[PDB]
Amino acid sequence: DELNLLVIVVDANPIWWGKQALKESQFTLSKCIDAVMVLGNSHLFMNRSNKLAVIASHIQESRFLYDGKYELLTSANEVIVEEIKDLMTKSDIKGQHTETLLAGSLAKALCYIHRMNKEVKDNQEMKSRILVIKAAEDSALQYMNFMNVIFAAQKQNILIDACVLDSDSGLLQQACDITGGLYLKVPQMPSLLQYLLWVFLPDQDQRSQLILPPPVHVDYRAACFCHRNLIEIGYVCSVCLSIFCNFSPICTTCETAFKIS
Amino acid sequence: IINSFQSIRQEMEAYTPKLTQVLSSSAASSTITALSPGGALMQGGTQQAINQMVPNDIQSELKHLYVAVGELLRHFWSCFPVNTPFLEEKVVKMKSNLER
Amino acid sequence: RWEGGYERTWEILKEEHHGQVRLGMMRHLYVVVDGSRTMEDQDLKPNRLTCTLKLLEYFVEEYFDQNPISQIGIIVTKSKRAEKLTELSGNPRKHITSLKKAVDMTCHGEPSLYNSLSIAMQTLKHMPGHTSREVLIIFSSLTTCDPSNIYDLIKTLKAAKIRVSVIGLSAEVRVCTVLARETGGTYHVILDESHYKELLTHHVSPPPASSSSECSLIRMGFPQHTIASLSDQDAKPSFSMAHLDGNTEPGLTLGGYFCPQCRAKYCELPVECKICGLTLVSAPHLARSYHHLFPLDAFQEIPLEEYNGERFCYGCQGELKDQHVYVCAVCQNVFCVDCDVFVHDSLHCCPGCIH
Amino acid sequence: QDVGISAAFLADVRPQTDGCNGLRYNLTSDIIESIFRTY
Amino acid sequence: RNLQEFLGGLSPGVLDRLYGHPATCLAVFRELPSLAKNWVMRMLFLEQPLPQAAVALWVKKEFSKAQEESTGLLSGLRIWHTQLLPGGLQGLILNPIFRQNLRIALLGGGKAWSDDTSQLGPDKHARDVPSLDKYAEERWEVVLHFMVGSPSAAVSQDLAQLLSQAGLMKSTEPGEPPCITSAGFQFLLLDTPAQLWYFMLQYLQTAQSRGMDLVEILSFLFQLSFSTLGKDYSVEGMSDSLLNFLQHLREFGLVFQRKRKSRRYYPTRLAINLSSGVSGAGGTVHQPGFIVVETNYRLYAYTESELQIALIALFSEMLYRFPNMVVAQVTRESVQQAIASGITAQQIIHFLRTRAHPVMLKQTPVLPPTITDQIRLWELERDRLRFTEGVLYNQFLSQVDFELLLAHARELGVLVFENSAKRLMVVTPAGHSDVKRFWKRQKHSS
Numbered sequence A: 001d002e003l004n005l006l007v008i009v010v011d012a013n014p015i016w017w018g019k020q021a022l023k024e025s026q027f028t029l030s031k032c033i034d035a036v037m038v039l040g041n042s043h044l045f046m047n048r049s050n051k052l053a054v055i056a057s058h059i060q061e062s063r064f065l066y067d068g069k070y071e072l073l074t075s076a077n078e079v080i081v082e083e084i085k086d087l088m089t090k091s092d093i094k095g096q097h098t099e100t101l102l103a104g105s106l107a108k109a110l111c112y113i114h115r116m117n118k119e120v121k122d123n124q125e126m127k128s129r130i131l132v133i134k135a136a137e138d139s140a141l142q143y144m145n146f147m148n149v150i151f152a153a154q155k156q157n158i159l160i161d162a163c164v165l166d167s168d169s170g171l172l173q174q175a176c177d178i179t180g181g182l183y184l185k186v187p188q189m190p191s192l193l194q195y196l197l198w199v200f201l202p203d204q205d206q207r208s209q210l211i212l213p214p215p216v217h218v219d220y221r222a223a224c225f226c227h228r229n230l231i232e233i234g235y236v237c238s239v240c241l242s243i244f245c246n247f248s249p250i251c252t253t254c255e256t257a258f259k260i261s
Numbered sequence B: 001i002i003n004s005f006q007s008i009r010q011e012m013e014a015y016t017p018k019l020t021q022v023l024s025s026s027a028a029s030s031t032i033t034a035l036s037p038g039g040a041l042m043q044g045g046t047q048q049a050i051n052q053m054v055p056n057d058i059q060s061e062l063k064h065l066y067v068a069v070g071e072l073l074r075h076f077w078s079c080f081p082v083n084t085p086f087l088e089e090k091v092v093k094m095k096s097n098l099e100r
Numbered sequence C: 001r002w003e004g005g006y007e008r009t010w011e012i013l014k015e016e017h018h019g020q021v022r023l024g025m026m027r028h029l030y031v032v033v034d035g036s037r038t039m040e041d042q043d044l045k046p047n048r049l050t051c052t053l054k055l056l057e058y059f060v061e062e063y064f065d066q067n068p069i070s071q072i073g074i075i076v077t078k079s080k081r082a083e084k085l086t087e088l089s090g091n092p093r094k095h096i097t098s099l100k101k102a103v104d105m106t107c108h109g110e111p112s113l114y115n116s117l118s119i120a121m122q123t124l125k126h127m128p129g130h131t132s133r134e135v136l137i138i139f140s141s142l143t144t145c146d147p148s149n150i151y152d153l154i155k156t157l158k159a160a161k162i163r164v165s166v167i168g169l170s171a172e173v174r175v176c177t178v179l180a181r182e183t184g185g186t187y188h189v190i191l192d193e194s195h196y197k198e199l200l201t202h203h204v205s206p207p208p209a210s211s212s213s214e215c216s217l218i219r220m221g222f223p224q225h226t227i228a229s230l231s232d233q234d235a236k237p238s239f240s241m242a243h244l245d246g247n248t249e250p251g252l253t254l255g256g257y258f259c260p261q262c263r264a265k266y267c268e269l270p271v272e273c274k275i276c277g278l279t280l281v282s283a284p285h286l287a288r289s290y291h292h293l294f295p296l297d298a299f300q301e302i303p304l305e306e307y308n309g310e311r312f313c314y315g316c317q318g319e320l321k322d323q324h325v326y327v328c329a330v331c332q333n334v335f336c337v338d339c340d341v342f343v344h345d346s347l348h349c350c351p352g353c354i355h
Numbered sequence D: 001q002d003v004g005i006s007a008a009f010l011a012d013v014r015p016q017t018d019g020c021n022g023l024r025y026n027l028t029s030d031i032i033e034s035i036f037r038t039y
Numbered sequence E: 001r002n003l004q005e006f007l008g009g010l011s012p013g014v015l016d017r018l019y020g021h022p023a024t025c026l027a028v029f030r031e032l033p034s035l036a037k038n039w040v041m042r043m044l045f046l047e048q049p050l051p052q053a054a055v056a057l058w059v060k061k062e063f064s065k066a067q068e069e070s071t072g073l074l075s076g077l078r079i080w081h082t083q084l085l086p087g088g089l090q091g092l093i094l095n096p097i098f099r100q101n102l103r104i105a106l107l108g109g110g111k112a113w114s115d116d117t118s119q120l121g122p123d124k125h126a127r128d129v130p131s132l133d134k135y136a137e138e139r140w141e142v143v144l145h146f147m148v149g150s151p152s153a154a155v156s157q158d159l160a161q162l163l164s165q166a167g168l169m170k171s172t173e174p175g176e177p178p179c180i181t182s183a184g185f186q187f188l189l190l191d192t193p194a195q196l197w198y199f200m201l202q203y204l205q206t207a208q209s210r211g212m213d214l215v216e217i218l219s220f221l222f223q224l225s226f227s228t229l230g231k232d233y234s235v236e237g238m239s240d241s242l243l244n245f246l247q248h249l250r251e252f253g254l255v256f257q258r259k260r261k262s263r264r265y266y267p268t269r270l271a272i273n274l275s276s277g278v279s280g281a282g283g284t285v286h287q288p289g290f291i292v293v294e295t296n297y298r299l300y301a302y303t304e305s306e307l308q309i310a311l312i313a314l315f316s317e318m319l320y321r322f323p324n325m326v327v328a329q330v331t332r333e334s335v336q337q338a339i340a341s342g343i344t345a346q347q348i349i350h351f352l353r354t355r356a357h358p359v360m361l362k363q364t365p366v367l368p369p370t371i372t373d374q375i376r377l378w379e380l381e382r383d384r385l386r387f388t389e390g391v392l393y394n395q396f397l398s399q400v401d402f403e404l405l406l407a408h409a410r411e412l413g414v415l416v417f418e419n420s421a422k423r424l425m426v427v428t429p430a431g432h433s434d435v436k437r438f439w440k441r442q443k444h445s446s
């Protein structure tokens, strides 16, 4: 009855992969796609009850991606390749939006997980986890919405695993710390698949007996809106929760004067 | 930037999956070494038994001192901030008690 | 004279978001539960006590989920007296443990509104003005014993700006209605366990802020998880203050959370500092309640036949066959019933709006 | 800690007639105080 | 005995030959423990041996028991093997043939196991999935009907020979049908997946008798297991031994084929789960229970086939026979007779629980506990006395000599029972000779 779902979100920002391609490094987007497909095939291999969900995170939208080889594996790989080529071939940069819709892809993944769980019969319990690979830079404006995702997963007790390739994201670190998922940056991009298999492939119960690298240290500093500097102790607004370094009689954000006689 | 985007778009527009190129034993060996005990990913390692390093009587006395200093400083911070002249003498007495 | 004649031959025949208003950013909630004889009644299976305590644990969980910087106090009124079962604090595990322990309580006597309210007021008499003072009471029996006048206590509570909410079980009580109305709270009647859960969920959300409520610039500190490693020579363990006041061995950890104001060490968050009174929180805790500041408006329900657009859900690609399809207000996307319910209930954000 | 006056302090309170001819009054201060307040 | 138990008992060469088939690799990997699966995936691309201590350091100290269990299971299955690492060390490395075949199965490449059915186009006489399942049920019911001895089931004589080799029916009198033995009786009450699994285990244990490649048969069985129900496959490309084995499977109904010359074949859900044996198929939507068990030891059957009638009459006295219903009563007499026939009470209880009518499922216990306990008590009362043939040693004049002889006999492991207080004991007839000789030799040495 153990139904393991491993939703994989792929950072499919064309700009970062173009930068990497111009660098002519050993690792490209094709290798990333191949590693993701192999990991998903292995996940489906480990048990019949296991399910695979692959969604590509792109700036324009979040795409639901899904001869001597397994029939279902071959069909799934064909579908994934078809969808990714259809998206990237028609991926026309129209606008200055560079940050990928990371939050939207996570929200769509959570909706898909909820729909699967509703479709899952009471006879079986569907353990769910999400693995996200980070390649491009992190986004700022999504932060709040990103937070809305995190607790939501913690609402349904879903692990969130982060695989940073190039650009670190403290948001991902905090999400992994909160939801209990694993955060780790790949030192050598060509070795990505083994990092996926050795660490992110086993389930948490399997991870329980397994010995794994300790989680990275996570900080929780704050930005003082008037200057957005690091702050240890700050003045918290009781109206709109805006934080200030110095005492103020009127809050800039809530526009409500602090009635301190 | 748009040129790089077009370059990668054309590069992955005609894409074929690969299997041998996915991983190599040398890369596998490096990954194992990183994941090996004592590796960079395996931060630190074993630690020391702090419990045996301090007697339980010393631990209990430390608890007593912690509670005493905590209550003293709690009263100090309760007096703070000094908004009345009476609070100055009270905090001075608090500091004297802390010193004693 | 029914014996004249009778045959069964003929029997044998073939056949609720309000406006963008200020809410309870900081709440000091006290829960008072009756322990009278009537708690053993079977209004809710198996009895009032078991269902009440189970739903109370669920309420505590949800309330701490949606109110990170709040507090919960548990008081049990039985035998015309009140017992301060649990102190006002923010630990969910301790309160759940106390409720599980009290599951085996002795339901006897009658509730005493006066004593319980007096104890709650005395506890909340020194609370800061900015923090809201809200009390929730579960009333099983219709009779209360008052060692003094009750309306004077009502006047004192109103002067203390302490909100009182009552959720009964039997029927409406005039005194409870007056108490709820005068102090600004709400009085509700349980129809079943489902209605009980609905009322508890409605009470989970922060109440609308009163006009007289103050708006002060409170000062809080945000320490990090300073973990000391024995590889460092400065790995000096110290018993946590929260764990120190415990029967078992307090947690003697090398590192943890150290107060930025008085260097007090705490192994659990979010916990207000015992020594200097500093409210030690974390950045996610503040952002955890932002959905209250920015509620998600209900989507437009349109019949599938009258919806002349796409036939797949935007959130799950589901082939929409239901008679009702929910369209977003902002980006006007296509969502099925399941996604429409879940996003508003849990996600609180429309992905298309983010896009 | 003050206890309100209950109307059942008479009917509920009975002289405990233990089988071995025991007249356990179980004289308690609160019962006597309730009697004094009521009567 | 599960599938892995039989695989763990085969020769290394058979395992190596099986590993050549990607489907076999997939089956073996899927049947591994979770920790074993994780280790295999880790070692999937490791071209160098792994130090044994390094492998052991990966798991929790507390889970070292399960770690070693998985390690020994993998070693016995010969998925991996130990290698003489330079310096005297012992590394671990997967089988290169098995590893390559697994990579082909997973990564892709290589050659497909069989050609697609589109070469012959659509089937002229195609069937439906419910039709295939019903046909398989009919075939198995016919097999069991022949096992009963009813003249309705006229099956192949080779099938009867196979059953006899399995020992189910002994042909004491040639020409007359063989009489079903006690083991056949026990098999008769097994669940249909269990019945098929036991029959296939016997066939495999007797695979060499027909001159058929065990490796090829196992590979084809795994391919059937991973096949898709409702889809046919190409008969061609298989050895004549495999062709006759497929004919046998068709005779059992596990695979449907309209004509012996037909190049298509439809595997059945029974065949699909046949590899899993008894477990794995947790969602078996069995036929509705038609047996009502009343507190007065009465069974009511909503059935019409003679097969279930015989199954019920095996342990109950038939009373009435209606067209759609059979009224029987479970007595001490009938249950004791069935136990004398070799059937264990647990088999009857489990069978009744299996064929439980939906009405009785509403009861929190499936069946009245009184009846189950009564059946258990009848089974016990059958075996109340204990019989053991042996030799009595009772002429012990010394306690020290008795202790020494008892210790020596326990060393020989031939002790039946001992009584130090009376210095009396009983020994096996086989172990009697050795103990007697030792006693005489020690008397001589005295």
Ligand SMILES: [Zn+2]
Residues within 6 Å of the ligand: A237, A238, A239, A240, A241, A242, A251, A252, A253, A254, A255, A256
């Ligand atoms: Zn403000």
Ligand SMILES: [Zn+2]
Residues within 6 Å of the ligand: C259, C260, C261, C262, C263, C264, C273, C274, C275, C276, C277, C278
């Ligand atoms: Zn402090």
Ligand SMILES: [Zn+2]
Residues within 6 Å of the ligand: A111, C313, C314, C315, C316, C317, C318, C335, C336, C337, C338, C339, C340
């Ligand atoms: Zn949907």
Ligand SMILES: [Zn+2]
Residues within 6 Å of the ligand: C328, C329, C330, C331, C332, C333, C350, C351, C352, C353, C354
């Ligand atoms: Zn929207």
